[PDB]
Amino acid sequence: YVCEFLMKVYVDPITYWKDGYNILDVIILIILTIPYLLRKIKGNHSAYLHFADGIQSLRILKLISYSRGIRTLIIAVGETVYTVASVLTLLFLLMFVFAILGFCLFGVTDR
Amino acid sequence: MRWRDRIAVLCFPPGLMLTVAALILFFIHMGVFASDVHNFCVIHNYDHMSFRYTVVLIFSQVISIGWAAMGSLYAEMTGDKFLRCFALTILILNGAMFFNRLCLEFLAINYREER
Amino acid sequence: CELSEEFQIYVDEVPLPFPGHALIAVATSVVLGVLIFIAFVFQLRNIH
Amino acid sequence: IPPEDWISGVHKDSQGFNMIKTLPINYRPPSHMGISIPLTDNFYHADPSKPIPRNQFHKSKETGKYKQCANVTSRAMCNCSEHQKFSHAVAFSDCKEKVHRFKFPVTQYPVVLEIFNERDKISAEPPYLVTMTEVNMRKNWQLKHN
Amino acid sequence: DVMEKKDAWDVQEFITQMYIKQLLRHPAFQLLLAFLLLSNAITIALRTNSYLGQKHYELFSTIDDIVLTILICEVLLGWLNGFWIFWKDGWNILNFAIVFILFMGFFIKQLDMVAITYPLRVLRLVHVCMAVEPLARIIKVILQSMPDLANVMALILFFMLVFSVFGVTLFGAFVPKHFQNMGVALYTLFICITQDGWLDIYTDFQMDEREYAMEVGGAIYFAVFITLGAFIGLNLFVVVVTTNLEQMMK
Ligand SMILES: *[C@@H]1O[C@H](CO)[C@@H](O)[C@H](O)[C@H]1NC(C)=O
Ligand SMILES: *[C@@H]1O[C@H](CO)[C@@H](O)[C@H](O)[C@H]1NC(C)=O
Numbered sequence: 001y002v003c004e005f006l007m008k009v010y011v012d013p014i015t016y017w018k019d020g021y022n023i024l025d026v027i028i029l030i031i032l033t034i035p036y037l038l039r040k041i042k043g044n045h046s047a048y049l050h051f052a053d054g055i056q057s058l059r060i061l062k063l064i065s066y067s068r069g070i071r072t073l074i075i076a077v078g079e080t081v082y083t084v085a086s087v088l089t090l091l092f093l094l095m096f097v098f099a100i101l102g103f104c105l106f107g108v109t110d111r
Numbered sequence: 112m113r114w115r116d117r118i119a120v121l122c123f124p125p126g127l128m129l130t131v132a133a134l135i136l137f138f139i140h141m142g143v144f145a146s147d148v149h150n151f152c153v154i155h156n157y158d159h160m161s162f163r164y165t166v167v168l169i170f171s172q173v174i175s176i177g178w179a180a181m182g183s184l185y186a187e188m189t190g191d192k193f194l195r196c197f198a199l200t201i202l203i204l205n206g207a208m209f210f211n212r213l214c215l216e217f218l219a220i221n222y223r224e225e226r
Numbered sequence: 227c228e229l230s231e232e233f234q235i236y237v238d239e240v241p242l243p244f245p246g247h248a249l250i251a252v253a254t255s256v257v258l259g260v261l262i263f264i265a266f267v268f269q270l271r272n273i274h
Numbered sequence: 275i276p277p278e279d280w281i282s283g284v285h286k287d288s289q290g291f292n293m294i295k296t297l298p299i300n301y302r303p304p305s306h307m308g309i310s311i312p313l314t315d316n317f318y319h320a321d322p323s324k325p326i327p328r329n330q331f332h333k334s335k336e337t338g339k340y341k342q343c344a345n346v347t348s349r350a351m352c353n354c355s356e357h358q359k360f361s362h363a364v365a366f367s368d369c370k371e372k373v374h375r376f377k378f379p380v381t382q383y384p385v386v387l388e389i390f391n392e393r394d395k396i397s398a399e400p401p402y403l404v405t406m407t408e409v410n411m412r413k414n415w416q417l418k419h420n
Numbered sequence: 421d422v423m424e425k426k427d428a429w430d431v432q433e434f435i436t437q438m439y440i441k442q443l444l445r446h447p448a449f450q451l452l453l454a455f456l457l458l459s460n461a462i463t464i465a466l467r468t469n470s471y472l473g474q475k476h477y478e479l480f481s482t483i484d485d486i487v488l489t490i491l492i493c494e495v496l497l498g499w500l501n502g503f504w505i506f507w508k509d510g511w512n513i514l515n516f517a518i519v520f521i522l523f524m525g526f527f528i529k530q531l532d533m534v535a536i537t538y539p540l541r542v543l544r545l546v547h548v549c550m551a552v553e554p555l556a557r558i559i560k561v562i563l564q565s566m567p568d569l570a571n572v573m574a575l576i577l578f579f580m581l582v583f584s585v586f587g588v589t590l591f592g593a594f595v596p597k598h599f600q601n602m603g604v605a606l607y608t609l610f611i612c613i614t615q616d617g618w619l620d621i622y623t624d625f626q627m628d629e630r631e632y633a634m635e636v637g638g639a640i641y642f643a644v645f646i647t648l649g650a651f652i653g654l655n656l657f658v659v660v661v662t663t664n665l666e667q668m669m670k
């Protein structure tokens with residue numbers, strides 16, 4: 001993985017800084033390298049262990065980053081990100097509305 | 112044209128309604144402000160303050176500010192510097208007036224009532 | 227015999243009465259109004 | 275409140291709030307038409323040797339009688355005891371200098387009354403009906419009762 | 421054409437053009453309004469805790485006054501262009517009702533309290549966030565889908581009633597407290613149609629004779645009715661959704 005970051009630390013970041021899967025994999029590399037750097041040799045004030053299988057699962061995600069067929073599927077489903085974000089924001093707005101409503105209806109009376 | 116006939120009947124020249132209304136509002140509001148500072152400074156008869164009418168004259172203050180600004184906007188396009196100076200001066204005195212009376216009211220909190 | 231008692235209560239830190247809230251509300255409103263109107267006057271005079 | 279901290283007047287309820295207030299000298303509670311013009315004719319922390327605070331206006335000039343700390347010279351001269359410093363009663367307020375303290379919204383303050391009857395302590399009974407009054411003519415307090 | 425000299429109505433039209441160019445086309449004023457609304461929404465989320473409230477209640481009152489006065493100022497600015505156009509609109513009516521209820525509950529004594537002050541604020545938040553583009557298309561077609569959804573609701577409730585006539589025959593005074601009262605029975609059948617965790621009801625009407633009784637008959641009748649109604653309702657919902665969105669991409 002260090003060799004991977006070494007061959008992605010080239011001038012190709014000029015295209016990795018505007019693309020999809022490329023910025024995704026370099027971000028995965030960064031959030032892989034830093035946590036085990038502060039975990040395997042920690043000597044620090046961390047909380048506890050909860051990001052070992054998560055790190056390994058990010059490595060598995062880097063494995064599945066291959067398979068150009070799945071890449072084409074990701075490209076074909078990648079134009080719905082704004083739509084699902086908008087539906088998620090509408091969902092969150094409805095949760096906030098009924099959150100304040102349920103609080104005002106049942107938690108302020110405190111019975 | 113015939114400004115005698117313009118001021119006589121059936122209409123007024125465009126603008127110059129809100130400016131005159133702001134002038135008379137300025138007159139009555141100097142009257143009440145002078146009465147307020149007088150009775151707050153010397154004669155001390157707070158039962159006859161303007162402690163009773165407190166929000167309606169604030170509403171009058173802000174609508175007078177709005178009408179002064181609106182008349183200034185409506186009379187700026189006359190191309191004459193005197194009208195623009197007139198409108199800007201009346202707007203400035205009304206605004207500084209408003210800040211002064213707001214400061215006086217905010218100073219006079221402990222004398223009205225308590226909730 | 228008369229059964230009576232007396233006590234004292236001190237309260238403080240009243241936020242504000244109605245005129246303070248009214249004054250701050252109208253002050254912010256007219257500050258926004260005069261700022262937007264100064265922008266209006268500046269733009270329309272500089273167009274001329 | 276412990277008596278040593280009642281003497282000290284520095285109590286904090288682990289929250290940055292003072293539970294004991296030392297009254298201003300010649301203190302008088304406010305009236306209905308204004309909180310800066312007292313019209314109660316009662317003197318708290320009274321001292322004739324000092325200028326009177328917040329006493330403009332003719333009606334407030336015409337009100338306020340010194341009962342215990344009379345023309346007798348000062349606070350150190352007009353004499354009081356521990357029973358007069360811990361008295362919450364009217365006409366013992368001329369040397370009343372430390373009071374309790376609260377926030378602005380006080381809700382559900384428990385008005386509990388116990389009766390002494392020579393062998394134990396009982397609570398107030400529904401046969402013993404109760405009248406509430408304020409000595410300083412205020413109209414900003416309400417009661418909840420069943 | 422030439423416009424050698426403008427007239428009074430041209431001056432008025434230019435003034436209205438300036439007034440609609442600002443605060444309606446300028447992104448800066450809308451961004452400032454959205455920033456203020458997001459800040460007071462942060463204060464909304466900071467509520468439900470007196471530990472923050474004990475040093476924030478006066479600031480909460482001040483920001484309430486500020487948002488109320490800027491809302492009524494915006495309403496007055498909209499009114500300036502004309503009362504008829506503002507009254508004949510699809511969403512300005514909602515905004516005017518929101519600010520009217522909020523202002524009446526503020527100035528006049530009302531039992532509206534927190535349950536009206538806060539949801540009205542978040543409704544105004546939703547209305548303002550609709551204005552920015554990448555939620556307006558999605559919002560526009562939710563309201564386009566409700567006329568075609570209303571007929572589905574009507575058919576569902578009519579079938580629900582005409583099968584509850586079958587329901588209320590085996591209901592009432594036996595296996596009670598969810599099958600009686602004729603409104604609790606209807607809403608409990610609605611619960612079972614929404615189809616989650618009805619084995620409490622299954623154990624409720626369980627053990628009639630322990631072998632068959634009506635535990636076979638009524639249970640299979642209501643089970644096939646529940647599954648048919650649930651499938652039909654979900655299908656009709658997604659069908660109305662797909663119809664109206666095919667409308668929005670057409
Ligand atoms: C002094 O105080 C006493 C208190 O009993 C009172 O009777 C007397 O009138 C007072 N005299 C003056 C001059 O204030
Ligand atoms: C203390 O004051 C009282 C009146 O307040 C007076 O009668 C008494 O003589 C005083 N005693 C001394 C020792 O000053």
Ligand SMILES: *[C@@H]1O[C@H](CO)[C@@H](O)[C@H](O)[C@H]1NC(C)=O
Nearest residue numbers: 382383384385417418419420
């Ligand atoms: C008074 O307060 C006490 C303390 O919480 C409570 O138990 C009681 O029900 C209250 N009574 C009324 C009438 O509010």
